[PDB]
Amino acid sequence: VIRSDTQRELEETIRPYDMGITLLDVNFQAARPPEEVKAAFDDAIAARENEQ
Amino acid sequence: YNRMRAEREAVARRHRSQGQEEAEKLRATADYEVTRTLAEAERQGRIMRGEGDAEA
């Protein structure tokens, strides 16, 4: 739903401008969490394994 | 790995524990038979001791 909204919103942002740039595709690449908190994210999974 | 490794160890501990159970059972009956034979000898020996003491 974001790639749809951000693509639609970006187009609306450049409508008044009237520039001749045409949007072809909006392809989301990555959403990784901050590296500082990545450590805890993996530990939560390891805890499940430790529980078992 | 710590989960799969731990699971395999559980089976290994179970097998070793099972073997000890059988071993203890066999040793238990062996001791009973040994005690029975020793007790029989003491009863027979007591008979002889009484005869000697009575004769003396």
Stated resolution in angstroms: 4.4
Distance CA A7, CA B53 (A): 118
H and E: helices and strands count for chain B: 1, 0
Axis crossing angle, helix B2-55 with helix A35-51, rounded to the nearest 10: 30
At CA B32, angle to CA B26 and CA B37, rounded to 5? 130
- Residue carrying the six token digits 């040994």: B34
- The method of structure determination was cryo-EM
What are B43's two structure tokens?
Answer: 């009863």
Contact assessment for residue A49 and residue B2, using Cβ atoms and an 8 Å cutoff: yes
Q: How many CB pairs under 8 A join A and B?
A: 5
How far apart (Å, rounded) are the C-alpha atoms in residues B44 and B20?
37
- Residue of chain A minimizing CA distance to B7: A52
Q: Is the Cβ of A51 closer than 8 Å to some Cβ of chain B? A: no
Outline where chain A has alpha helix (H).
2-13, 35-51
- Which residues, at least 6 apart from A38, have a Cβ–Cβ distance to it below 8 Å? A32
* Contacts with A, B 2-31, CB within 8 Å: 2-3
